[PDB]
Amino acid sequence: CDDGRTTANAACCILFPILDDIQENLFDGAQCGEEVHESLRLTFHDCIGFSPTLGGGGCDGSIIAFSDIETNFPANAGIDEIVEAQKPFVAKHNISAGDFIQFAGAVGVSNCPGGVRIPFFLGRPDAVKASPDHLVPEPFDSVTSILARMGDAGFSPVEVVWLLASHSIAAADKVDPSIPGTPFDSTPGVFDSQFFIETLLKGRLFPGTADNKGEAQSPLQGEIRLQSDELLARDPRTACEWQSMVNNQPKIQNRFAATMSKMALLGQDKTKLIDCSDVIPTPPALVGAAHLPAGFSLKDVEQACRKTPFPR
Ligand code: HEM
Ligand SMILES: [Ca+2]
Ligand SMILES: [Ca+2]
Ligand SMILES: [Ca+2]
Ligand SMILES: [Ca+2]
């Protein structure tokens, strides 16, 4: 390649001006802030719009291409601004929206401490059609409906748990509109196991207004809990996997990267793409060991796995 850098394949040098723009003009100087949290989420809301029988283009960038339609899906509340945030970048550069969505996601994760380098591929065509509605899992859906939807897209129950490691770097804006920016765990700027830990704590309070659609009771003030994350943490089909995450940053990193790659290829083929994983920067180290919040004991944690009691 040219000024600065060089990578395994020549067509990957195009990503580097892109890499520079989004770190400064989208990620606030390569930080793990809100825009990073929304780009990661965006990859899912684009890709999960796929079903072998119901339709959808998958990771086709349709959520940007047909933002008028898809950003007004009820399940896409609050996505319309990461779309408009990424649009000027899609406009100036010559990669497809499908490619850019995944790149911004991958690059963004590597800005977060404890993060991982997700494999990124280049060459997706432009979006042909808008995704059908009702393909995006809602936080008030049952475990069965979530697992069936993710399963219909080709994800096993354990894979769903793995992909939900994303909630370690996450916050909600539309669940409780009164308290926007309330994170899913106590360490939203760090990619750790604190999400799986605090989810297993018992419900104690509502951080904002009284229960509204998709919200379960939170353990901590300044933290919000989705109704879907609470159930998945306790459901026999996934409880043991959810608890196994509270243990293992290596596994968390390992599994989050292997499945995101699988997700990013939904309806896209292999050989038509080229590999530019070389481009993704390397995340900083983990900033502290796992722990229960102050004032909490191992009793405060709910047990949902019958095989192995919650590991101290
Ligand atoms: C499987 C069922 C899932 C459900 C029901 C769900 C639900 C939600 C909801 C309701 C929000 C907050 C929306 C708002 O800001 O108002 C959220 C945030 C987020 N989700 Fe999920 N999600 C799921 C899976 C995933 C997956 C597979 C990923 C993969 C990357 C992911 C990544 C994220 C991220 C990064 C955020 C933070 C958004 C922000 O900070 O604004 N989620 N999720
Ligand atoms: Ca799509
Ligand atoms: Ca639903
Ligand atoms: Ca975290
Ligand atoms: Ca206490």
Numbering used by the authors: 3 to 314
What does the paper say about this structure?
Versatile peroxidase (VP, EC 1.11.1.16) constitutes the third family of ligninolytic peroxidases, which was described 20-years ago. VP combines catalytic properties of the above two families due to the presence of both a Mn-oxidation site and a catalytic tryptophan in its molecular structure. In the present work, VP (isoenzyme VPL2) from Pleurotus eryngii has been subjected to protein engineering using a rational design strategy.
A third approach to improve the stability of VP was the further structural stabilization of the distal Ca2+-binding site, responsible for maintaining the relative position of the distal histidine involved in enzyme activation by H2O2. For that, the VPi-ss variant was designed by adding a double mutation (A49C/A61C) to VPi. The two cysteines added to this variant should form an extra disulfide bond contributing to the structural stabilization of the loop containing two of the four amino acid residues that coordinate the distal Ca2+ ion. Finally, the VPi-ss structure confirmed that the two cysteines introduced at positions 49 and 61 form an extra (fifth) disulfide bond next to the distal Ca2+ binding site. This region did not show any additional change compared with the native enzyme even though the two new cysteines occupy positions adjacent to Asp48, Gly60, Asp62 and Ser64 involved, together with two water molecules, in Ca2+ coordination. VPi-br harboring seven additional basic residues exposed to the solvent, and VPi-ss containing two cysteines added to form an additional extra disulfide bond, further improved the stability of VPi at acidic pH (respectively). Both variants retained 86% and 85% of the initial activity at pH 3.5 after 24 h of incubation compared to the 61% retained by VPi and far from the 1% of the native VP. In short, the extra disulfide bond contributes to stabilize the position of the distal histidine in helix B. This analysis, together with that previously performed for VPi, could explain the accumulative effect due to this disulfide bond and the extra hydrogen bond and salt bridge interactions on the VPi-ss stability improvement observed at pH 3.5. However, VPi-ss did not show increased stability at neutral pH compared with VPi, unlike what was observed at pH 3.5.
